[PDB]
Write a protein that binds this ligand. Structure first.
Ligand SMILES: CCOC[C@@H](CC(C)C)NC(=O)[C@@H]1CNC[C@H](C(=O)N(c2ccc(C(C)C)cn2)C2CC2)[C@@H]1O
Ligand SMILES: *[C@@H]1O[C@H](CO)[C@@H](O)[C@H](O)[C@H]1NC(C)=O
Length: 336
């Protein structure tokens, strides 16, 4: 590992508190794409001009045209990326990617199959996986590993700031942290193992009692996830305690009850990470005649990573997060 004296920041747009995306340039001249930076995955992909227009998501998104890039290098190996929310399929290509001023030669997926559900709901075009090579489909070197290889970054770390919505939507710092977006000190939690941004969780409290994860559990710290998620079983118990009602894809409370809900605490490392109802309820009205969604849902993550909780944007909004590759740990500080 070679270290430089450079930090690079990526400005993010906050779409409805669920999607936080930045811009990347691909090829020569650059073709620009809106992308989510996801610590829960390790591949880079954007939709391809080779995507049949029968996929309406390809009609509505920006497409990479290899035929317009003089720096493109063919590969063609088939790739399928199976996310918990949906799947994309396509093939590998190589080109120059610009992210926050840094330019890097990167192998990425050109997606030719992009299902209308959920991708018609994506404000972003593609994803930049911020995970480790161990989780990369096709053993493709992830972009942060390629950026580290350049020996320009001051530190082998990257940090996320997600705003709560003229205001900055969010910010990723490659090579450091931005003290303008946090306060107090970082408290670090070591990874269970290298290869996954996952830490041990010692308990989940709903009110003053630890009713969940009593004997310990896992927490994936997932920047690409919109919500906090737990297994169906853990979430059924959490929601029972909140008095929330299960719907198809989410949980709801009567809008008037939203401000009465208890605090939820996540026991990580030596500290309690507390969210008040204002942090996890999408409070759209105070009406006793309307239902308000919660920013916590059930998601059964399969083994070897799962069963696990995932601390997505709901969590990161309250806690500025540093992902430390040099020391295999995650730091949290109160977001400012
Ligand atoms: C196979 C490569 O994936 C690895 C896998 C491992 C996990 C389960 C531990 N990784 C994952 O499953 C991802 C982990 N991080 C959140 C991601 C996400 O939710 N996405 C998402 C967000 C919004 C929408 C909208 C269109 C509403 C669609 N997708 C984006 C990455 C696509 C995926 O769940
Ligand atoms: C695609 O990249 C892999 C990885 O190095 C390589 O082994 C393979 O030969 C490439 N395929 C083509 C056709 O370029």
């Amino acid at each position: 590992l070679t270290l430089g004296n450079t930090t690079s920041s990526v400005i993010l747009t906050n779409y409805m508190d669920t999607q936080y995306y930045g811009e990347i340039g691909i090829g020569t001249p650059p073709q620009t794409f809106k992308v989510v930076f996801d610590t829960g995955s390790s591949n880079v992909w954007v939709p391809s001009s080779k995507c049949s227009r029968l996929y309406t998501a390809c009609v509505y998104h920006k497409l990479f045209d290899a035929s317009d890039s003089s720096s493109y290098k063919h590969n063609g190996t088939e790739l399928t990326l199976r996310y918990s929310t949906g799947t994309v399929s396509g093939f590998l290509s190589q080109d120059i990617i610009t992210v926050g001023g840094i330019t890097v030669t990167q192998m990425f997926g050109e997606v030719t199959e992009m299902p209308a559900l959920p991708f018609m709901l994506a404000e972003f075009d593609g994803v930049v996986g911020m995970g480790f090579i161990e989780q990369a489909i096709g053993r493709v070197t992830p972009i942060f590993d390629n950026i580290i290889s350049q020996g320009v970054l001051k530190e082998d770390v990257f940090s996320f700031y997600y705003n709560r919505d003229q205001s900055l939507g969010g910010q990723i710092v490659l090579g450091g942290s931005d003290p303008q977006h946090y306060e107090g000190n970082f408290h670090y939690i070591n990874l269970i193992k290298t290869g996954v941004w996952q830490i041990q969780m010692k308990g989940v409290s709903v009110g003053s009692s630890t009713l969940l994860c009593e004997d310990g559990c896992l927490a994936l710290v997932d920047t690409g996830a919109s919500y906090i998620s737990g297994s169906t079983s853990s979430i059924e118990k959490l929601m029972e305690a909140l008095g929330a009602k299960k719907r198809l894809f989410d949980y709801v409370v009567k809008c008037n009850e939203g401000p009465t809900l208890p605090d939820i605490s996540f026991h990580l490392g030596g500290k309690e990470y507390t969210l008040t109802s204002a942090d996890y309820v999408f409070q759209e009205s105070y009406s006793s005649k309307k239902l308000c969604t919660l920013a916590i849902h059930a998601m059964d993550i399969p083994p070897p990573t799962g069963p696990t909780w995932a601390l997505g944007a709901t969590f990161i909004r309250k806690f500025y997060t540093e992902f430390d590759r040099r020391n295999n740990r995650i730091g949290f500080a109160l977001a400012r």
